[PDB]
TrEMBL record, chain C:
Organism: Xenopus laevis
Positions spanned in the full protein: 702 to 765 of 1019
Localization of this protein: Cytoplasm, Cytoskeleton, Microtubule organizing center, Centrosome
Designated name of the protein: Gamma-tubulin complex component
Assembly behavior: Component of the gamma-tubulin ring complex (gTuRC) consisting of TUBGCP2, TUBGCP3, TUBGCP4, TUBGCP5 and TUBGCP6 and gamma-tubulin TUBG1 or TUBG2. TUBGCP2, TUBGCP3, TUBGCP4, TUBGCP5 and TUBGCP6 assemble in a 5:5:2:1:1 stoichiometry; each is associated with a gamma-tubulin, thereby arranging 14 gamma-tubulins in a helical manner. Gamma-tubulin at the first position is blocked by TUBGCP3 at the last position, allowing 13 protafilaments to grow into a microtubule.
UniProt similarity note: Belongs to the TUBGCP family.
Organism domain of life: Eukaryota
Task performed by this protein: Component of the gamma-tubulin ring complex (gTuRC) which mediates microtubule nucleation. The gTuRC regulates the minus-end nucleation of alpha-beta tubulin heterodimers that grow into microtubule protafilaments, a critical step in centrosome duplication and spindle formation.
Lineage: Eukaryota, Metazoa, Chordata, Craniata, Vertebrata
Amino acid sequence: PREIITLQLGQCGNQIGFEFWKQLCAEHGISPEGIVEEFATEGTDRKDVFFYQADDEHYIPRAVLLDLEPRVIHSILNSPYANLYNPENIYLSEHGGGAGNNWASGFSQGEKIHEDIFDIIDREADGSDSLEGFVLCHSIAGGTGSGLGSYLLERLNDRYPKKLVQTYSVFPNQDEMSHVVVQPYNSLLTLKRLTQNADCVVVLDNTALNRIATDRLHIQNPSFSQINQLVSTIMSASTTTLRYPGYMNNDLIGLIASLIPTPRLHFLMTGYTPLTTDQSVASVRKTTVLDVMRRLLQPKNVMVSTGRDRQTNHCYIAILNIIQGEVDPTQVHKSLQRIRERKLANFIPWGPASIQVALSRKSPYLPSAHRVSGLMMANHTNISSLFERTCRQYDKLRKREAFLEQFRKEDIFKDNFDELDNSREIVQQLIDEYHA
Amino acid sequence: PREIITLQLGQCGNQIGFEFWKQLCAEHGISPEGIVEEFATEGTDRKDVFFYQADDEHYIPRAVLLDLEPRVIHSILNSPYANLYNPENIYLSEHGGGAGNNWASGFSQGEKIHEDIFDIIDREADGSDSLEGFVLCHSIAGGTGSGLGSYLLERLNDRYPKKLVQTYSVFPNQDEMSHVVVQPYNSLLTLKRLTQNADCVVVLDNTALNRIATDRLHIQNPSFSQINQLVSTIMSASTTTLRYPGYMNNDLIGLIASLIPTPRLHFLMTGYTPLTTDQSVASVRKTTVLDVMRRLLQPKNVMVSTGRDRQTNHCYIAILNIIQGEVDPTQVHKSLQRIRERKLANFIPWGPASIQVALSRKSPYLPSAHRVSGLMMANHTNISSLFERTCRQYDKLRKREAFLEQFRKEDIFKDNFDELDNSREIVQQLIDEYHA
Amino acid sequence: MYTLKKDYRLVEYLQAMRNFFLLEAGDTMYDFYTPIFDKIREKEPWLNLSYLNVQIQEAVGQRY
């Protein structure tokens, strides 16, 4: 089994992982307490490589939902999904915590529910006989999800360090600063852990998110409850090599390893094209495969903020372009030929880059049976642009004298302020030294 | 016509056989009067095998209960099955007792109640067609089972040499020293008769009993009432090749002949999978029969405390895995294909070992015809740890100067203490020599 | 072609040997491979025929 145990943590990290499971139930066509169709084995050929294997003809996800506020998990028992999950082997109903908005609460709460936090992942791993890893779906948004998630990057990198560590971080909207004020602190605190307590991550941003939500989803005002729709689908899109047949890189640690050349450059930008429902009327005339990877190499679907004058002094190094559903697997070699003549992907000025192309067959569902799907998993060397945005609001904040002694009460009593600042400066420099 | 007389002796020896007779009436479907279930003859093809041979459709336990403690036996005659019991060939109704709680109390009371203790097994062997043997359901806890139990370990070795000897040696929690402290003295006098005047023992430790009582029946604070279900089940469990026909090693001296390499090594560890209520959910469609002995390939349910790291400095020699009821047996030859490949049970290197597989029919009673069962009767040479553990509790007791003249006011007036030490080290060398 | 499609299931047999040794299959031949390949990585005898005959037994039971 290539069972990955998801570590959903956080007020926002729970919800984006919640519709990740409901999506899998909508396309496998299942009841959340019974397997009522033959689409479970005809549609999908593995259904328990991320789920606990059938012993009642039913599938139980390999997810744990622990959080300081029991209120996000109490909203799972008002939906028919609290018998898809179980009452202690997924989540403990009424597991309290802090206030919680402090990072230093959640960091100390992993150090005293320390016994139970590594029994819940191993209660829910009694059929993993060869573990993939642990993916921490933990949000930076809120002090709840960033505090307890930063603890678990450390204890799972000292017992399972060669196994996958990979987080879906979402840095809260950096154009508010009177909604969240602890925002440069909780970001730089997890960012220290991504580079020496972790292998690879897949970063995201909220302020580059909502750009797309009004351009391809076309909502009237960004609010978190549509943001979770767009995230929950790219999480089921990235595992379509491991839940359906394949061979070359048919593991989730097969895809992600080949997007790393050097530590401190492994931050993957995510892009996903079929969010528009006006491409299902342009498939009666055929949407082609030639141009569906000419909008993946275009920067339009970018969920990580960055300049359009920082891609002329930087080039992409590794870019993976995943088609699902229709593809036509004889003209996919016709699709890559025209890439080099336009040059929509930049190539590193010290050797050839890499365009890895993949295809995968899927279960019947609407962007994998009527219309083309493109997942991008980019690797660009302009990723220091978020780190400069968070580090210039962190030292500015220290110039307003905020959280230098209103943060030293609970388990910070040394100078660790310059520890986040400098380790961020090693990252901002080492990327530029290895990129001309 | 293979009638066994259980000999309950001691304080703990009376509580464990109480629910043993209570398991038999509930699975044979019978009333304490007559027949109310025709599964009584169709399911059990040998109803009489621990019971009186009926001649008016009555069944009588072949039980004898002698003990110097009237508190434990007064809870046996105030039972609904106190009419299954008759105080006229078993015991008195309101029976008496010795001091007791001393090994010299019950050893001397053994020989002035010598007429009735060998005229109460021959008042339960008068319809007998040949006696199988005697099972000494005696305690290692206190001086009561151990005083009176050391006597019958001797006389059944020479008034009854042909007949089978086999004991349920149950330890108390050995870390008591204020309700019992004479436990390493009374233990070793009985442990010496058990290896030279007895052929087989069935060892049971208590620290691995409470190991199950908190993770398979789940109490927050221990009780000794979740300890008597665990023994009473494994008692009826060993006799599924004998209460219901076998074919080969259909005798109980057949199982034991292939489980004993030679006396000097005969201490069988016992293991039992269906003690938990989460094994009735693995028989609603039948879970596969490949995995029910690859959980006994390295135990995790043993009623004998031992390390899991003392399985690589020791080598199993004989291991029996008796499967019971409906298991859909046709992929059971597939299960022995996969045993050699893992090797979690090391086999002896001076010569071949034995992987014994059995199946047995049982009545259509729900926990004997639905749940997947693995009953282990192991014989592993890592048992030398228990003998080193009682001997470390003796030698510490003699330097506090306790029982150097306090135990030799009664029926000890000669040296025999280093005889108990030496006889333990010959037994300990000869267990380890059989894997050398 | 009526008895060679229903009586004997010919074309299902064709994709079946292709799943074996053309590598057209899923994580069937993948999970056969990585136990053997972890023994190669430390240069310890992986042949050892016997366990390999149980590794393809385990292969064909993956994906179901």
